[PDB]
Amino acid sequence: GEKLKEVFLMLDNNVVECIKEITESSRNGKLVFFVGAGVSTLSDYPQWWRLVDKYHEELYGSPKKGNYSSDEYLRIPQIFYNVKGEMAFDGILKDFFQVDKPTNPIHDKILAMNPAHVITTNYDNLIDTACWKRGKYFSVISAEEDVANATSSRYLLKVAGDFRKGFKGENVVLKEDDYLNYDQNYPLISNLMKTIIATHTIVFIGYGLGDYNINMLLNWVRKLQKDSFHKPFFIRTDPSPIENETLIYYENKGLRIIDAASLIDSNEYDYLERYSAVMDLLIESQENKFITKDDEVIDYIYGKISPLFALQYIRKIDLKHVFEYDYHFEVNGTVVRHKNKGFGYMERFFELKESCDERSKLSKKQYERFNALFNFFEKNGVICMAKDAGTLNTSIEINSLAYHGKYDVMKKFIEEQSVSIEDDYKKAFFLACLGRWEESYDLYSNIILNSIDESNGCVYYLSQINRYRIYQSITQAVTQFNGLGLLTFGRHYKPFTDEFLARIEREMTNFNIDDLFNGMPFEFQKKYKILEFLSDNQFLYDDTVKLFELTNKVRSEMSEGSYSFGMSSDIVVLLRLYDNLRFLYENCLWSVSFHEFHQYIRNSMSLLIEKAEYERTRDIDELGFSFFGKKSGFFMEYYDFVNISRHFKIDDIKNLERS
Amino acid sequence: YDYHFEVNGTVVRHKNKGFGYMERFFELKESCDERSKLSKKQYERFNALFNFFEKNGVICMAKDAGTLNTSIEINSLAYHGKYDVMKKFIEEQSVSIEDDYKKAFFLACLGRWEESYDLYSNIILNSIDESNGCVYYLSQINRYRIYQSITQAVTQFNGLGLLTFGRHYKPFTDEFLARIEREMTNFNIDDLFNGMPFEFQKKYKILEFLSDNQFLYDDTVKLFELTNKVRSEMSEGSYSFGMSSDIVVLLRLYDNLRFLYENCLWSVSFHEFHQYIRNSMSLLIEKAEYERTRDIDELGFSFFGKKSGFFMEYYDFVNISRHFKIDDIKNLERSCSIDKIRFGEQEKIEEYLVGIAEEITKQFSANGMNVVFYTQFISEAKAALYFAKYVKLSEEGLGKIVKALLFYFPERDLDIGKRYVWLERLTKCNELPKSIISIIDDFLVLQAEKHIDQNYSEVSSNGLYSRDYGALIKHFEKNFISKRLSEITLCLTQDKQKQIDFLFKLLPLLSTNAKSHLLSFKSVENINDLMNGIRIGLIDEFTPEHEELIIEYLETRKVNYIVEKEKGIQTFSSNDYMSTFGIWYFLEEINNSKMEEFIGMDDQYDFFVDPENFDYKKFIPSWLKNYNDKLLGKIAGNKHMKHHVIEVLKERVKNSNDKRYLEILMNYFI
């Protein structure tokens, strides 16, 4: 139970630096388990010594008298195959391997460690059933034909064959002829295995440092040059603890060993105790339960928020994806525990803030990171926890000259010299707002060259989107210029030359925005997962379906005087609108001018006004005319004027004046 | 994106600069001569496509635009409420895995979620053949929405479900939640479509929208845009012109219901999908009020006399009965005149209303209450019997409905007062025959057989008690008497206390030997029975013992709220007796001249007694909805009340969607 936390403090510096690197690879999606016979025997599966007891007695008459020599143990199923045929070799395999045995809790812990691939030398079907119970598909590969006919790009690579194509012995490598013809019969299973090891993080489960598979894999590693490959990890589940001279010998061969008999004290036959004490020590280090240092909560919040310093504002509905749904961040600034089955690292952060002596107990590096996080959350308006919600005032502030319509200040900003690549990303958004879309497409193009040779993830990605959106904004404008805009304008032409419109067609040919985020680096796709939605053809669909809980459902609320607890439905819609405007205008995203965004402001603002009317008039006939207030309760302000003035057609303001 | 496939069946090309292949397909459809110029292996494939588009209702393009008709068929047992047929389908050996997917949906609709969670789980282990992920993907979704339905049930069963359900129910064992919590933890519904093989994606792209809200988004945007277009068209004079805003709303609603029920998706039980149908139907009913009132000349008489939202069918009754709450329907009953809206298919509706009444009896009479099904089913059973006002039902179907609404309906979700509200609505398109009065009379003798203890009362929210069931009898048939109520009056003594008050409230239902024997046993001694005496027609002219006790109650009220205001408590119109005294003084039923000193107790009482002194800022506009015909005639005769409360009606005509305030104004006060 709580033994694992007092095991964890007894780990040395070697095992802690193994658990920190196995768990950083599971979060990156580069973790692969290499599964042996150890997890198959913990499900009662017929071991290969129970077969070799069958052959020696159907080929030598009597059962075995003495131990198997290694000369005999390798060659008994080959003597049976050569002398007693090939249908009887497959008969004995059919007699023992029709079992339908259960999956051990270790098959669940491997998959709960979220692997990208699973390689196995097990010819059983036990790992393949457990993958299909969960909501991820693995392309099972057990023959040569399955590699080119692969489907899902997450492989369950069975490098020792399988019995999916029948209980035949020609589909599973078992004999000695199948051990020496493996590179001839399986050229593509070997190359696919050696490429996953070269490109991922490998952990071996179910082996014992002398195996035919571990030794033929450490020979391949001897051929590779120094420091080009990551060293595989090796979980050792044996009764005897590892001796120090052996752990030196396998670390120089390229294995990073985590001995399970060196971490817990267990009996000689309790293999689930040893397998679960290393797997649960990885799983409960990811589901962060081994954080009891009060300055490890700083470099955990810093490692997920220091990416987001490159952006200006982050929505609070996006911060519940940064922390992997552990906390709700409500629009008041309150943090509410959701799915954190671990240590309260956000509860502790707000206990550093009100305090100061608990804060002087930090280091000389992790105290400056507290001042980076405190200057983050104060800017974004994350205030406290749920149980400290006093009298809160969340006033919206949009610091953007394009929102406020300072058109002459933007023109001076365009003429001035460009010191940064951020001061150019702001100009190209100011170019597009002023309608000089000719120069905006070119200036985004100059950012796309200069940001990919300078290790800038956001400014490259946000310029790919805004160049495509201004490409859409041009190519659907000329549709009005050839049509309605030919008789409206006196010149009967666009300011888009025939050379410019033809040039953007060569560059934007076959440019799919749907594959942009996956064509970014792996560190971009983890640190900036919150920016995936901008490339999507339709966002704001959660915000639109959550408008039915506005003036539509005032039927049961106003008929009995029902009010929403905490933040009311008026305040949640109005402050998730303000988070969308502050995210889109401060991060200079050109998707703020399109019809999907403008109709969302029309749908949400009208329904907030129609709820404030239906309620105003339900209070009049229920609780008298003089007792009901003349104001509707919907108090409009500066930011509410600008949003109605910018996003509404005049036929849409006429609808509010009637309703 | 090569073609628009509109909701009528027509095809308009967009983003297709290449070859037009759906242009060719309908040229191959209606011309058999160009057919059989094909091959042989590509000809049996053609018989699948012609059967496919005939099912999905795709017709020729906008060039050869024929007159399409508005028809819909949902061949789903869970849609029509065939509860006994589903139970005989679940208790039957399954042939295929496609029949396992329907039983897991039919268990889930029957509230047997613990079995459906298991039955969806068996499909997941048995759907290994990669014939198509369509079975495996749609069962991962439907299981995770069952777990979402269990988790929000056990939050409202082991949490809030103690005082509102009657007990601390545990319909799901702790061994069940110890299984379902660890299984559904670390299960991302956003990662289900992306972790799925590439043969499934780009062959089943349309099913990715089922993991979140974006299968409703394209119809939500269209519903919000066409709502403002209709509310602009309802004010600017234009009717439904051709392919108008009403048929686009109706066909998208029908395609959503038919995609979700035929494919057995458990997204039918969301809140957000119950909100889409609710706003889609309340717009069509509001447009139906505008198309029935006819203004312009013969261009609109042929355009749409009563079609495309102006007429009601069986599928429209079931959508309102399942997806509305009662306050949802109570909105439309004053914004619209649903009594003027013609309901068709009134024999298919009658099979639906009988099946609901015959699934309350198989759920609340026998054992096995099935409290999980009881949460989902009771809203549909309440809204169907509330909206059964406007259908015309035969005698053999109404008898099962009244005998369920009275007896077998549960009292936790419908008290004794909210049975009279719905028994009276079944007298709008119906009378009370001699076969329905006998069922109401069977219910009054059941409550009279339970009024022995004094501790038993009648918790009524509307103020309407079990006396009004007999008042609904005496409204139709004046010459009626009751048999078993005239037998229970033989036992009159001081043993049972609650037999004293309940039998007094049913006096015209009694016989001559029953009424005289009751008056020989007791008489009136309180004004509470005097309020009961008017509703039974006991005393016409009040004896001066009453007019003493009328102001004696007012004098005790003058004792009451003076010392109650020091403590902050108030009894303002608690039992409405002094308000009923106010109508009595206003209709000159009391000749006392002492209530000038009683002015200043309640705002309603001060309105009736001294209208010159009562400032009309404290007047509540809902009071005019509760006055009868004779009372408004005297208000039309006054001058003090007359030319001032119109200003209250003037701010309710042009600010409230209640059409009653217009009716009180034009028929009485002007």
PDB file of N, CA, C and O in Angstrom, chain B residues 82 176 179 219 251 278 326 365-366 405 460 516 621 639:
ATOM      1  N   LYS B  82     -41.912   0.121 -27.797  1.00  0.00           N
ATOM      2  CA  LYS B  82     -42.385  -1.261 -27.785  1.00  0.00           C
ATOM      3  C   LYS B  82     -41.603  -2.012 -26.714  1.00  0.00           C
ATOM      4  O   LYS B  82     -40.655  -2.748 -26.989  1.00  0.00           O
ATOM      5  N   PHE B 176     -19.685  -3.758  -8.302  1.00  0.00           N
ATOM      6  CA  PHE B 176     -19.836  -3.304  -9.678  1.00  0.00           C
ATOM      7  C   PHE B 176     -19.029  -2.034  -9.922  1.00  0.00           C
ATOM      8  O   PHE B 176     -18.282  -1.944 -10.902  1.00  0.00           O
ATOM      9  N   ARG B 179     -15.489  -2.526 -10.177  1.00  0.00           N
ATOM     10  CA  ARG B 179     -15.084  -2.995 -11.489  1.00  0.00           C
ATOM     11  C   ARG B 179     -15.118  -1.892 -12.536  1.00  0.00           C
ATOM     12  O   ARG B 179     -14.164  -1.765 -13.309  1.00  0.00           O
ATOM     13  N   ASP B 219     -26.020  21.343 -37.278  1.00  0.00           N
ATOM     14  CA  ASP B 219     -27.453  21.544 -37.133  1.00  0.00           C
ATOM     15  C   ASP B 219     -27.799  22.563 -36.063  1.00  0.00           C
ATOM     16  O   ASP B 219     -28.906  23.104 -36.083  1.00  0.00           O
ATOM     17  N   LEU B 251     -36.446  18.310 -41.492  1.00  0.00           N
ATOM     18  CA  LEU B 251     -35.760  17.165 -42.077  1.00  0.00           C
ATOM     19  C   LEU B 251     -34.411  16.902 -41.429  1.00  0.00           C
ATOM     20  O   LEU B 251     -33.972  15.749 -41.378  1.00  0.00           O
ATOM     21  N   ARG B 278     -35.774  19.916 -28.678  1.00  0.00           N
ATOM     22  CA  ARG B 278     -36.668  20.842 -28.004  1.00  0.00           C
ATOM     23  C   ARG B 278     -36.702  22.195 -28.690  1.00  0.00           C
ATOM     24  O   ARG B 278     -37.777  22.778 -28.871  1.00  0.00           O
ATOM     25  N   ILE B 326     -42.026  19.366 -18.499  1.00  0.00           N
ATOM     26  CA  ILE B 326     -43.387  19.882 -18.442  1.00  0.00           C
ATOM     27  C   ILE B 326     -43.392  21.401 -18.541  1.00  0.00           C
ATOM     28  O   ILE B 326     -44.267  21.980 -19.194  1.00  0.00           O
ATOM     29  N   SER B 365     -46.753  -1.760 -10.164  1.00  0.00           N
ATOM     30  CA  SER B 365     -47.662  -2.622  -9.416  1.00  0.00           C
ATOM     31  C   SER B 365     -46.929  -3.840  -8.870  1.00  0.00           C
ATOM     32  O   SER B 365     -46.951  -4.106  -7.664  1.00  0.00           O
ATOM     33  N   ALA B 366     -46.274  -4.592  -9.748  1.00  0.00           N
ATOM     34  CA  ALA B 366     -45.539  -5.769  -9.318  1.00  0.00           C
ATOM     35  C   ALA B 366     -44.204  -5.371  -8.693  1.00  0.00           C
ATOM     36  O   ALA B 366     -43.823  -4.198  -8.664  1.00  0.00           O
ATOM     37  N   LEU B 405     -53.066   6.776 -14.597  1.00  0.00           N
ATOM     38  CA  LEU B 405     -52.806   8.118 -14.093  1.00  0.00           C
ATOM     39  C   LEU B 405     -53.387   8.306 -12.700  1.00  0.00           C
ATOM     40  O   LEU B 405     -52.903   9.134 -11.922  1.00  0.00           O
ATOM     41  N   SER B 460     -50.395  18.183  -1.492  1.00  0.00           N
ATOM     42  CA  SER B 460     -50.760  18.721  -2.796  1.00  0.00           C
ATOM     43  C   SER B 460     -50.002  20.019  -3.024  1.00  0.00           C
ATOM     44  O   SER B 460     -50.050  20.923  -2.184  1.00  0.00           O
ATOM     45  N   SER B 516     -78.022  12.932   4.737  1.00  0.00           N
ATOM     46  CA  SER B 516     -78.783  13.249   5.939  1.00  0.00           C
ATOM     47  C   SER B 516     -78.160  12.612   7.173  1.00  0.00           C
ATOM     48  O   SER B 516     -78.176  13.203   8.259  1.00  0.00           O
ATOM     49  N   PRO B 621     -49.332  41.001 -11.987  1.00  0.00           N
ATOM     50  CA  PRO B 621     -50.147  40.725 -13.179  1.00  0.00           C
ATOM     51  C   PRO B 621     -50.672  39.302 -13.278  1.00  0.00           C
ATOM     52  O   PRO B 621     -51.616  39.071 -14.043  1.00  0.00           O
ATOM     53  N   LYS B 639     -64.974  52.029 -12.234  1.00  0.00           N
ATOM     54  CA  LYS B 639     -64.250  53.122 -12.863  1.00  0.00           C
ATOM     55  C   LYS B 639     -62.947  53.329 -12.114  1.00  0.00           C
ATOM     56  O   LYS B 639     -61.974  53.845 -12.672  1.00  0.00           O
TER      57      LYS B 639
END
